[PDB]
Ligand binder design. Structure first.
Ligand SMILES: COCc1cc(O)cc2c1O[C@@H](c1ccc(O)cc1)[C@H]1CCC[C@@H]21
Ligand SMILES: COCc1cc(O)cc2c1O[C@@H](c1ccc(O)cc1)[C@H]1CCC[C@@H]21
Lengths: 204, 207
């Protein structure tokens, strides 16, 4: 199972499962087109998430319907870290705050996205950490609105992994749990952005 | 000065700051909505007082104090609700003289879903053996984290609360591994309370 993998194997597995950075092929049409092409990859990525495929098809689908937008958003935020003030939706679709105002109600979400991006930059989020957070989001957003014990052992597994990475990075015990906490609190914001995002979508 | 408190002082200050449990005054969609809102308005007053006793909160500008309370008040009301609904399986203790089960949620249009979410969370708390000391720490984190990205001072209090939480677990006898694992389970649930607050605002803003 996934419960038997070591911290290094979990990370290595997660890294190798990573989806590719897709390209942007009226504003909304590009984002939905890009988002929809991204969705196909997400699914195949989910199946590579240790612990995921051990669930019933119904649960696998419930977990994806629940977190797909948070997942797209954390990926968006991730590739935007080295472009302060901008959101890199795709290598050929990097938009800034002003371009957001273009669509109705999008400036509020952009600012939250940029803010979450600064936070990651300010924190120096590592790629190894990032893939862990993304998996935690997958297994955690639909888990309370549903197996369950399995999901919780896997989440503890990823937590161990996260801590393991910090230990190796050289952080002290106290820094380790302080960072884990900071990283996890950010998921609340991502959850919040996803909710706003859904509202913005449903109104179209 | 709040950044100078020890894990034990932090706990004491938080438990002392705790606001009181209020009482409410078949239900129709109209009266039930009035009972809940009346209770909420009265609770909000004590929350603001409680907010001011949260280490580092008053050190913030008035504009930031208002932003934090404005974005987190429902999450705070709901975590309090979930907390006092632990011992009452399948029910929500909005107040002693107001314990509603899921069926009394259908009374209001589209509230039964918020109800199921709230109840599930209550189960998770019960299931996790959530302790009052841990509970006051989460509530505080909720307050300070809800609008922090929409600052340096705020993150130190948070780190202070993280250490307290761990401290509480260490004393309880959990191994280092169990400490980090429990810390995560607790924090991942704030993600769900956030969602509930969000669906809650939608429902409230809907009428
Ligand atoms: C960004 O504002 C949220 C947002 C608001 C909205 O009304 C519509 C959309 C939004 O994010 C876009 C997105 C595209 C690619 C990504 O990697 C992430 C998100 C797509 C996702 C679904 C429709 C469209
Ligand atoms: C199902 O609750 C969501 C909910 C939906 C809604 O449309 C209206 C309300 C709700 O929660 C109630 C609540 C009252 C006391 C508490 O301790 C916690 C929540 C109050 C809070 C603001 C208006 C009312």
């Amino acid at each position: 199972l996934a419960l038997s993998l070591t911290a290094d194997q979990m990370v290595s597995a997660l890294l190798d499962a990573e989806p590719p950075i897709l390209y942007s092929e009226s504003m909304m049409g590009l984002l939905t087109n890009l988002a929809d092409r991204e969705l196909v990859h997400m699914i195949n990525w989910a199946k590579r998430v240790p612990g995921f495929v051990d669930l019933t098809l119904h649960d696998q689908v419930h977990l994806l319907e629940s977190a797909w937008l948070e997942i797209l958003m954390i990926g968006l935020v991730w590739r935007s870290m080295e472009h302060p003030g901008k959101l890199l939706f795709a290598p050929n679709l990097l938009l800034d705050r002003n371009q957001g105002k273009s669509v109705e109600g999008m400036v509020e979400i952009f600012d939250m996205l940029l803010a979450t991006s600064s936070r990651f930059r300010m924190m120096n989020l590592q790629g190894e950490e990032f893939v862990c957070l993304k998996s935690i989001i997958l297994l955690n957003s639909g888990v309370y609105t549903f197996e369950k014990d399995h999901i919780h052992r896997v989440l503890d597994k990823i937590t161990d992994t996260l801590i393991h990475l910090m230990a190796k990075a050289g952080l002290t015990l106290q820094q380790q749990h302080q960072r884990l906490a900071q990283l996890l609190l950010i998921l609340s914001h991502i959850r919040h952005m996803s909710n706003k995002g859904m509202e913005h979508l449903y109104s179209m």
